[PDB]
Symmetry: C2
Subunit: 193 residues, 2 copies
């Protein structure tokens, strides 16, 4: 059993992260597991622990935060929501790739907690077409572009969401390429011997 | 700037077969790195297509003048990669695909680390001399960036295309493109 990879897809709000993540999971060639979040809220109708969420108490959640066992977390209306280190680690050690789609502020928490993850920045198609366009809106668009390029330096790869199908193909290519790195390939061959 | 893609692996692994299939693929944007040789053309071979056919005098002068990226002599015949052709195509934004023997690949690695080194792996490795070969192939592999099994030629081709596209999507390269656009 080769170690799984944590694949983190982020990028600005409205770039199509949700749509790309859905298409990645619909693709018959992918074999990712979705990251299951831990929450302190109680289950709703049809929800199962270990399937929809890891339902835990506030005490358990805060203890996980204090012990550095939380990759990312936030409190949304008195309820904690977060990505637990223990369950991500168990799946990676069992050889399963985990795919996590998250907002840019959440991604920086995950990056600090798990630098071994593969961080993909989903890019607006307008970023390359910026010059093919001073108004306060033009000044804002140029400022947005500069900050996206600066944010991108924290990521491993940047993929343009020109066509959802194209972003999916590039993401599959990234994950396959990461598994072909000789450090990982040698590990497989040595464990065989 | 174009990427230097170096495909290597042991003799008989199918480097030639995989390189031919890579160039037959309609999606390939790679330009084949044509080697220079002092041997005469074989049946169906053309200068500037299959090889740069040159005399020993020209080749030895290119060696002496530091104009070879890598070279070797095999039973009186020189084979090598001219440095200028590579450097010019890379600067013009063309990706270069170089299929070479393991000893040639290590010359290129020393000269140009920025290259993407792909080790084409025998399928029998996962399945006394055979064990010794396997151990040395695993040891060699550590000097390469990626290792691709030649299980099915079509599968090796898609993994190689995937490697080149992924290297193009690295944020260091993507940021460089966007900054130039910015000004
Ligand atoms: Na596809």
């Amino acid at each position: 059993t080769e170690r799984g990879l944590l694949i983190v897809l982020s990028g600005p709000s409205g770039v199509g992260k949700g749509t790309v993540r859905e298409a990645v999971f619909k693709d018959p060639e992918t074999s990712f597991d979705y990251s299951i979040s831990m929450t302190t809220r109680l289950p709703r109708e049809g929800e199962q622990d270990g399937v929809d969420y890891y339902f835990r108490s506030r005490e358990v959640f805060e203890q996980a935060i204090k012990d550095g066992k939380m990759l990312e977390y936030a409190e949304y209306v008195g309820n904690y929501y977060g990505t637990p280190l223990e369950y991500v680690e168990e799946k990676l050690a069992a050889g399963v790739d985990i795919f996590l789609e998250i907002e840019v502020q959440g991604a920086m928490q995950v990056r600090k907690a798990m630098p071994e993850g593969i961080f993909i920045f989903l890019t607006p198609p307008d970023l390359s077409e910026l010059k093919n366009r001073s108004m306060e809106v033009v000044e804002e668009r140029m400022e947005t572009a500069k900050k996206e390029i600066e944010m991108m330096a924290s990521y491993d790869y940047a993929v343009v969401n020109d066509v959802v199908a194209n972003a999916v193909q590039k993401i599959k290519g990234i994950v396959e390429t990461e598994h072909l790195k000789t450090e990982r390939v040698i590990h497989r061959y040595k464990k065989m011997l």
